[PDB]
Design a protein around this nucleic acid. Structure first.
Ligand SMILES: [Mg+2]
Ligand SMILES: [Mg+2]
Ligand SMILES: [Mg+2]
Ligand SMILES: [Mg+2]
Ligand SMILES: [Mg+2]
Ligand SMILES: [Mg+2]
Ligand SMILES: [Mg+2]
Ligand SMILES: [Mg+2]
Ligand SMILES: [Zn+2]
Lengths: 83, 115, 178, 68
RNA sequence: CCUCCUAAAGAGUAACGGAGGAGCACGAAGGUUGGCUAAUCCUGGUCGGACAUCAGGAGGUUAGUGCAAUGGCAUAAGCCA
RNA sequence: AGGGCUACACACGUGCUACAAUGGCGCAUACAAAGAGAAGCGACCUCGCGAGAGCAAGCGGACCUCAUAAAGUGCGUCGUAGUCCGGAUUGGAGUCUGCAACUCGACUCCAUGAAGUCGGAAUCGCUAGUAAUCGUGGAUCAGAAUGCCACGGUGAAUACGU
């Protein structure tokens, strides 16, 4: 994981777009490609449509997701068994 | 000897005898023995009940045995109920930390299942 | 003994003063304590039935009744009259002394003890719990144990209701999950 | 109670690590030094508590201390 | 040879009429004295599960009778010493 | 830009680590050879259990650094047990590099402690400083070797014969 001396990582476009959303009370899904951004406690209550490769999976943010990247809740590979 | 909730092997030396606790390995046992002031080479059967009592009393600050099993289950259950990538790997029994599954996932996947 | 005198001194008055009983002996009392080992694999080996009987004789103060099968069952490959159980009812001073020994020694000797279930009643004030291992009792040592072995304890009381039986065992400080 | 059928029931002394000295009859046959009692267990004393199962926001703020 | 029906409320009553069993078992599965009451279901309870054993309840003979069927059987003819 | 090449009921090749006592571990201690280095190798000192961080000397190098080699030896312990063997997997806490370590990095700590007790038919390498094993360095490279290339230490057995 990333060092604690360098802080957590969040993409600016998302950080500014979720500050705008939490400032204006936006309930539309936050459309993003930034799967590398750590979830901050100001996304709590919003749904983030995180990319996974071919569509934006919407993930509603709860208290337990804080400190996880956005991409952990968007599975990229599809697998439904072999036989 | 009965430290925590389980039985410690009496015939062995303290360090290994204490490592028989879910939550105490070799260096945590060494730290327990060094804070108790007992040699690690002495057998547990050859030391007094007051030494047993203080060994229990400073094992007790380490979350161990069933409390540790509760904490580990709760962390894995939190991952699985949360439904992240680590949660889905724990749910499907696949390796969680990025190992290969084309070959050599045998510990996580159990024995071989022929088609 | 200590708990019959405890019972007769404070548990009777405590229950009276909350349940508003009109009579003195409307208070619940415990009637018997029954210990059961359902061995099962005695048909494979009669000697481990004797081992479980010696275990129950050490755990209680009494020799156990070797209990046979009531009717013939195919799924466990038993016939009627095949001995598959051990039963002791204590029922008196040895009941009170075992209740002390249980409540004081054996229940805090349970590995990972988060509490006994308060929903483990039959609906008529009688309690049943399951001891997972006979080592929780200090009558048997760790050395000469052939195999691990649990048992079943039922407290059969006088009480007519769930709330009475729950209220009575708490008067003796029973470890309910609460 | 029958006579030559039952195990020997003698009075012995049970002593805890907390200094709980106690007189109980049993079939042990010797005095014993038990290690947990009913005045000693964390459930009996109420010291068990629970696991955390939360505080991810507090863990975040403690490990980071970030402005904004 | 035994049991039920046919068989018409005493007995008996035929057909290549309708249904089933017997050619034994037990020195206890006999005698007696003392005692006891079943099936099934529910609710709890270590392994233990649909079903082993324990505890309580509902139930009231729906069980049991060495073996078919019928008639009996709680004073038990059933179960134990 | 994000994902994939890293998937996973399975099958095979090539490795690595083992199943231990000719060893595991703990303390002390002896002996290398080759090579690399300036958007680099980075001492000494301080801090950290550690990965590592801060300060910072020297070095475009027979100078300085990577970099006190390991097996070995000596003392002790373990006593044949799935173990003080083994180290897979997993949880928590971290470090570094890089815009960025979720997919999908290496490493550290604490806990976890999986299979495995020498491997069926079959099959491979090797004739001497060889096989076996024990460390070390390089290229590629921000980071990312159990691979490859190279380097020493210990060091056999066996070949009647076609
Ligand atoms: Mg007639
Ligand atoms: Mg007539
Ligand atoms: Mg008869
Ligand atoms: Mg691209
Ligand atoms: Mg040695
Ligand atoms: Mg090891
Ligand atoms: Mg050079
Ligand atoms: Mg095995
Ligand atoms: Zn105590």
């Amino acid at each position: 994981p990333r060092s604690l001396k360098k802080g957590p990582f969040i993409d600016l476009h998302l950080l500014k777009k979720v500050e705008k959303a939490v400032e204006s009370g936006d309930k539309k899904p936050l459309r993003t490609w930034s799967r590398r951004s750590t979830i901050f406690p100001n996304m709590i209550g919003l749904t983030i449509a995180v990319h996974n490769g071919r569509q934006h999976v919407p993930v509603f943010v709860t208290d337990e997701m804080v400190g996880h990247k956005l991409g952990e809740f968007a599975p990229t590979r599809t697998y439904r068994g072999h036989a | 000897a009965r430290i925590a909730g389980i039985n410690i092997p009496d015939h062995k030396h303290a360090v290994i005898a204490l490592t028989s606790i879910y939550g105490v390995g070799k260096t945590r046992s060494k730290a327990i023995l060094a804070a108790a002031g007992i040699a690690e080479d002495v057998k547990i059967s050859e030391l007094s009940e007051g030494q047993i009592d203080t060994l229990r009393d400073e094992v007790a600050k380490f979350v161990v045995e069933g409390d540790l099993r509760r904490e580990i289950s709760m962390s894995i259950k939190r991952l699985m109920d949360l439904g992240c990538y680590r949660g889905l790997r724990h749910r499907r029994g696949l390796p969680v930390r990025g190992q290969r599954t084309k070959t050599n996932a045998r510990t996580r996947k159990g024995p071989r299942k022929p088609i | 003994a200590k708990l019959h005198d405890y019972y007769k001194d404070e548990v009777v008055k405590k229950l009276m003063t909350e349940f508003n009983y009109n009579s003195v002996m409307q208070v619940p009392r415990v009637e018997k304590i029954t210990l059961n080992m359902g061995v099962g694999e005695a048909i494979a080996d009669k000697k481990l039935l004797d081992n479980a009987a010696a275990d129950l004789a050490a755990i209680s103060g009494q020799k156990p009744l070797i209990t046979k099968a009531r009717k013939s069952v195919a799924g466990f490959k038993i016939r009627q009259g095949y001995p598959i159980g051990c039963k002791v009812t204590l029922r008196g001073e040895r009941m009170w002394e075992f209740f002390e020994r249980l409540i004081t020694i054996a229940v805090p000797r349970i590995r990972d003890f988060r509490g006994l279930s308060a929903k483990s009643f039959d609906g008529r004030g009688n309690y049943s719990m399951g001891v997972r291992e006979q080592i929780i009792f200090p009558e048997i040592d760790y050395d000469k144990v052939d195999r691990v072995r649990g048992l079943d304890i039922t407290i059969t009381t006088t009480a007519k209701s769930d709330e009475e039986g729950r209220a009575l065992l708490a008067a003796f400080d029973f470890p309910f999950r609460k | 109670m029958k006579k030559d059928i039952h195990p020997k029931y003698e009075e012995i002394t049970a002593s805890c690590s907390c200094g709980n000295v106690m007189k109980i009859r049993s079939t042990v046959g010797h005095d014993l030094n038990l290690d947990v009692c009913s005045k000693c267990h964390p459930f009996f004393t109420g010291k068990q508590r629970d696991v955390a199962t939360g505080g991810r926001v507090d863990r975040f703020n403690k490990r980071f201390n970030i402005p904004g």
